[PDB]
Amino acid sequence: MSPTEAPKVRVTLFCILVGIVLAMTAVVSDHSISAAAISVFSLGFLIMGTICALMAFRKKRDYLLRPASMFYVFAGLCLFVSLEVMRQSVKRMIEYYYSWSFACACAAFVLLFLGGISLLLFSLPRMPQNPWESCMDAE
Amino acid sequence: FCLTLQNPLRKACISIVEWKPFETIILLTIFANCVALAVYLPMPEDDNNSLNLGLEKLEYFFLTVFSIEAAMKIIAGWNVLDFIIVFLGVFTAILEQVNVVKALRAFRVLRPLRLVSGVPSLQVVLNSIFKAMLPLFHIALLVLFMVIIYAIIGLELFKGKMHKTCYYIGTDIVATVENEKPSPCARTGSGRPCTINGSECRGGWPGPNHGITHFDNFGFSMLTVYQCITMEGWTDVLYWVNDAIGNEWPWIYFVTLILLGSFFILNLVLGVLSGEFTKEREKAKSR
């Protein structure tokens, strides 16, 4: 409710799901050899993240919003790597440019990454800002 | 008080001047001896003029006067340091005659510390400085840990990049324009390619500052990190790494390092110092 149904966390998750679907597109929308292993690893990270990110709402098992974000984060952090291995492959295998695939990937990286970081900071309890408060407190 | 601690009163006979103006003669001699160290003129690799050969003699006079002072003071905290000074002095003086030593003449510059140990109104100030050096412990630990983290980061990322610069083709002469410094180079990569007309970029180069500033091992990396923390020539390393390995990724390690050396170090240190000085004001006023 408080960390699961607040407007900010809700819109951030709404942004990260669009990030995931654009990541799927940039994976399929094709426009050096390890560029596929990093991608399937990022996809598995997205699956492992959404597994616990869906079940975080129900049963009031809210704490699982903390690990989920990381997976999303890492998903992005994986895709970016592939991004570079594309760019370097252009300088490895004239005029070139970055068509649909690369632009969608460069958008999805920032969206997924910043959304996951913001989701982590919104799920993490609080910065005390007062001498009596502390992290890991009851409600 | 009221102790002999060595032997009965038959020995402590010469202790009659210790209450005389003795705090103005050995101090006067220490000030005359700290001036016999300023007029010494060091010459390159074992040369000497007359004045230095005269000071070498006068050093015997000074050592002997200090030793007889310690001899009229033994039979009667900082005197520990005074005896260490006299011990090092006599060690040096006998070693330089056994041969008939620079590491044994370097300790001769501790003599002016007897001048602070003389006046008592200065030892209270020195003690205040030492006592105020205490509450900075957590800040010191944080600075050490941060320097260590950044040294390790730089050691991972830039380990062995700054080792190429365009010499002249068939020559071992680094090619620079008039006012340039020998910055690194890179061929067929991201790094800057140079444009001196008869120049080629080939490896086998010690480093930018004759091999002093680079990230090869942990030592030189920690040195470069400490130097960048003092905000002196950090743009030089930024450029030597922002034009020899890329140009849009090595700007983070340095800018952040500054913001963690500019913001936090100064803020924390000035804060704790002002706090301790406030507590000093209160303990001096409320009485």
Next chain:
Amino acid sequence: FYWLVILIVALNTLSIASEHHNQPLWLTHLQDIANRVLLSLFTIEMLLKMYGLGLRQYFMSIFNRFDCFVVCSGILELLLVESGAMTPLGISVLRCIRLLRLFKITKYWTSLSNLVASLLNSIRSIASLLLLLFLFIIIFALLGMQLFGGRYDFEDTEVRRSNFDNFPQALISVFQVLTGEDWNSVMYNGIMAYGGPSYPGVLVCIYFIILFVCGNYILLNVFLAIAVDNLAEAESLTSAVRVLCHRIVNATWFTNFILLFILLSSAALAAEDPIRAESVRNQILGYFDIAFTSVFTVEIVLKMTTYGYFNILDLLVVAVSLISMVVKILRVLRVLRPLRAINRAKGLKHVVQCVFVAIRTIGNIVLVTTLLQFMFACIGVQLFKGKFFSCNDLSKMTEEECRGYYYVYKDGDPTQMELRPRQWIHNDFHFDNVLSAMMSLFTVSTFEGWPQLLYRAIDSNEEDMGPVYNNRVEMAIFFIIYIILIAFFMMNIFVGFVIVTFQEQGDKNQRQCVQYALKARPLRCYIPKNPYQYQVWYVVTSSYFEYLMFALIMLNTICLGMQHYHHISDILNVAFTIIFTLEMILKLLAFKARGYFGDPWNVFDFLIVIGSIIDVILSEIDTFLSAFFRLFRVMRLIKLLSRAEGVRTLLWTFIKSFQALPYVALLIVMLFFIYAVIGMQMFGKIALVDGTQINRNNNFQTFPQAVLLLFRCATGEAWQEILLACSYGKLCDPESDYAPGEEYTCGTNFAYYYFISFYMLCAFLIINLFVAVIMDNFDYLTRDWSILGPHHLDEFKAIWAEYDPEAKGRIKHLDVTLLRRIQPPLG
């Protein structure tokens, strides 16, 4: 009488500040007769007040004690100069002592006399600590003469003036290392003077680390005990039908949207290229600016339909866009959108007003600081007037001789020479007039480039000849007495003024525990049932396991430091990742993710674990057939401060205070944004020629490069060399527009007003952000750790949940048995 004396004092100050090199003869004929008539009128007024105040009223009044001094000194100088007075430096110093007469305007000024009394009290309190500092400097100068004395026996021809040959030069070099200017150049000479970057040679790099860490610690203990212990005492003693839109114009919709409508309208100038004003992107930015001005003229007309300070600011920023349509001045005066945000967020209002009152508080101390600078400038003009010329080759000592061509030998090799035309070059920062002298003293006061002026003043010859090697070694006293005052003293008391005022504007134990008493709450511990897993839980929380993890982390760090340049770093990392994943899985099994994802430190631990595993996987792929993914192994030591009781608390304190003033950090961001675009427009076409201070890494071409240059100038790098690298005559890069012949027209003297101002404001701002935090936490900074502190109450809070699993309000009265664990400071 005050105006009666201020007229003549101001006229004398004008006659002083009228002098300069190459002045016409009539200017000297005016200055000398003005000195004569003003000395005679000073005599007249002295004798008038003597006959009118009694003989025994001019030798005890300190305020007017040295006017007899003034007149007698003027007479002495007159009679000494009127005779045969050789050594033009003698005339120079005789006119230097003349400059004392301008102190009557400071003495009659009562507040200035009170300030003199305050400063003299401070310095007479800190004289002993200053003596100790001076003695430490002498000890280190002697140690330097021992180590590097005569060891600069370099076979090459580069000059190294900051050496340790004799005692005055050792003192100068030690002072230069102390003030932290160019000290990293005096270290490389001391290194290469020994073997080099070898094992026994680099060990001399610790003479310059002790001298700068413990030589700047004393220096801060001195000049900050003058501003919390004698400057604070001064203040202490001083104490004793137009409604269709009137509905939403106040709603969060309109305001929250017109706020974000600027942060993207400002970015219309960021994404800009100034070399060619017409390309495929500037058209798009102009098209966006059409909307970015229309959707704001709509705003201002929607404001005007309802009504008739800041509204006029918005009006001007929206009226300049209509005339966006001389020609290069309007384009510069169009970045005004970032300013008109103070009346919208209502967060910048308070910070702008507090800093505009902080400027108000500071005024009587800055007046004398700018007078001292103006004072020293006149002394410099008397000393180094015109002596800063120098030929191209140091063998020609006159402008008549410095012509033709000469030889330049590369690497000092007498068989590899080139021809270069010699030229009588006037130094960049000189002392010809009080304006240039004030500029040079300004650059000296910021410590950037002061040795290059010191070794030029030392070499000064006559009044129009080339520099003689070490001519005057006693010329460094003027550069050491000015850096010890204005650049050391005044600045440290000016910061004390602010600091002390913050405390005033910013018993006590009872005013925090009450909040801690009623606003606190019990704590969580997550003590689990079902001994099946409690078995591993008891060791998971045990102390020796955390000691083992401490040891393993330290071992990981030592193994990470062992690496060097030119296969033991590939497998030990796998072993460490395995052990830490074991730790993760274990602590996950003894908490069931319920108490694992409660503590933020385990949240961070899981991140590190997954990152390191992914790193190992990518390294496996690398070895089968992402440099930054290895940073996750060095992050493993950041969790070393899970046991840092006094360091984690300090970070908490000094982090929860950077989130209380995010607006004072918005002022600096607005300053950088406003100055970067002005820089890009004014000096943006200068060619990037290597060897000059505007090169491929330091330029105004793009926006990030401009911001990086501004950061370099802020942090205190060689900004006065950039200031001369972008001033009216640099080569325009070819991709710009210029008629054949109009090529050397890039840059403009406006640079002098651009950089100086930026170094003032920024400095000022960097003070506020630094003190606004220091005043924010004067609770923690001044906390007696013996009487009562929230450390005691946090200990009590943690001991409470030791017996109480969950909150459940209070517990049974039996756990009185825990009251025997609290301390007398609490019970």
